[PDB]
Each structure stands twice: as structure tokens, then as C-alpha cells.
Symmetry: C3
């Protein structure tokens, strides 16, 4: 079970286990994701990953809030972006 | 394990790996990342299979075989902003 | 399975995973599409680039400043990938 799908609509892939990495466990961090819509503008308010801003990411099919796009605030950081996804919002 | 997906024509050139496959919501494999491809021309939305993306022809850098297309998002709110759609028959699963 | 590739010096800091490895064309340098926990030092240079058409930028562990390798950035838009990491294999430790 490599595919990680939206738990709400069940059929929509958001990421795969192949994309998981460890920046430092409610929040999965992946390099890549799909089938997400970004809501609003980035914010640093209470960012869990200092030096990154977050943007709400919802399932493009059912609007379930799956997590956030994290965007680097400085060009010297790696990666420049990633996804922090709520593990309970994904199947498996 | 045949993890490496190589250009079937020149055989030696890796284009992607099974690690990069994803499922966008089928003759065409979609991967987040690929290598050893040259882009031909400028992006086009004409008859795009993935609405909201433009396509650019992608050929093997070694033998110029047409492997597939780079897909590039037309809007900032889409994820991913880019991916590759590769013709499955243009690739050889290689254990290396 | 040791999927995680960590900085050998500070041991606990993940830099990449085996999932991100690809083959551009050697023994010494691992090429991966994605990495984390690296700081870029200075500006890109093509001087003695091992990967013709790419510039290199020194990449050091953000925790202990160990020189792990380089960010490679494409000098032409038609190349794929547009960036990757070339990491000295001996600077990394396979971990969980
Ligand atoms: C409800 N809620 C939430 O889940 N966050 C996440 C957003 C992502 C992150 O990095 N850190 C947070 O605390 C909020 C941040 C500010 C205000 C309200 C917030
Ligand atoms: C020969 N040919 C082709 O293969 N396509 C692909 C390009 C990729 C895609 O998304 N959709 C297509 O129909 C064409 C699109 C327009 C005109 C001619 C085309
Ligand atoms: C000490 N040193 C080094 O390791 N390199 C690498 C940088 C990465 C690459 O592609 N090629 C190299 O020769 C140098 C390149 C120029 C001058 C001094 C260099
Ligand atoms: Zn959904
Ligand atoms: Zn070829
Ligand atoms: Zn370190």
C-alpha cells in the first residue's frame, strides 16, 4: 500500500510512501503531492517548521483539509517547498 | 528489482524510476521527476489530457526517441506545478 | 530497511532517501532529485562541473556544517531535471 489517499473521498491519491522524508508524527512530510488546492496566501504564524510559511491544502475533489504546503522564506534552505499532511486525513 | 525505467530504444538511458510514479485524479505513466529528456518547443494547452496543464514534447537526450511530455500547471493553486506523462511502451523496466 | 541517508558527521540529520536516487549517466557521487536539511553556500559555478550543462553550489548540513555535496542547477531551460543534488556517498550513513 504505497498510495496515500484522501480518507474522506477515498479514491483520490494525495501522495505516496516514496515521497516521505524526515525534516526532524501527527504530520507526514513529503516532497511531492497531487490533487490538492491551495487556499489563501502563505503565513509564518505558529509555523511548525521554522523558516517555512504554510498555505492550507485541501483535497481538490471533496475539499477535505489534508494539510499544508510549506514554502521556504530564504533561498538557501532545502527543500524550498514540501507538504505537511495530517496522517489521520489519509488512507492508509 | 526492475526499479529503473529506461529508454527502450537506446536501452542504457534512465528516464525515471518506479519510485516517482503517482496517480492523478493509463497508456501514459505519470511521474513527479524524470531525467535525460530534452524539451522540444514551448508549452501548449491544445487537447491537454490533464485539464489545467500545458504539455511540452519530451525526447530522449541520447537517441531523440519521443518518450512523452512535461506537463506544466496554468494556475498557481494546482499541485503538482509540473509532472511528466511518459508513454509506457517507450520504456524498459531495468533491474539496475 | 535503511531508506534514510543521514549526515555521517551529526548522524541524526536526514539529507535524502534511497527513494530519490536516479542515474544521469561516478562511484563517489550519489545523484538524488530531492534532499533536505542542507544550506547553500555562495553562488552557482560551472567551473569543472562533473555534469555538463549544470552549475554547482556547495551544500552543507544545516546542523553540523559538514560538506555533503552540491546542488546542481541547469544552465538551459530544455534540460531535465532543472536541479538535483550530487552528494558524496562517504559523507552519508544509511539509517531507518
Ligand atoms: C488552526 N491552526 C492550525 O492548524 N495552524 C497550523 C498551520 C500549519 C503550521 O505550521 N502550524 C499551525 O499551527 C494554525 C496556525 C495559526 C493559527 C491557527 C492555526
Ligand atoms: C500528436 N499530438 C499528441 O500526441 N498530442 C498530445 C500531447 C499531450 C496531451 O496532453 N495531449 C495530446 O493530445 C497532441 C495535442 C495537440 C495536437 C497534436 C497532438
Ligand atoms: C574543491 N573542488 C571541488 O570539489 N569541485 C567540484 C564541485 C562540483 C563539481 O561538479 N565539480 C568539482 O570539481 C571544484 C570545482 C572547482 C574548483 C574546486 C573544486
Ligand atoms: Zn477528498
Ligand atoms: Zn534513448
Ligand atoms: Zn550534519
Amino acid at each position: 500500500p504505497t498510495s496515500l489517499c484522501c480518507k474522506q473521498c477515498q479514491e483520490t491519491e494525495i501522495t505516496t510512501k516514496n515521497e516521505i522524508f524526515s525534516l526532524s508524527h501527527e504530520t507526514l512530510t513529503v516532497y511531492k503531492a497531487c490533487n490538492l488546492n491551495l487556499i489563501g496566501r502563505p503565513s509564518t504564524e505558529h509555523s511548525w517548521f521554522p523558516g517555512y510559511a504554510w498555505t492550507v491544502a485541501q483535497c481538490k475533489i471533496c475539499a477535505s483539509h489534508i494539510g499544508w504546503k510549506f514554502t521556504a522564506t530564504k533561498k538557501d534552505m532545502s527543500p524550498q517547498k514540501f507538504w505537511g499532511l495530517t496522517r489521520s486525513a489519509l488512507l492508509p
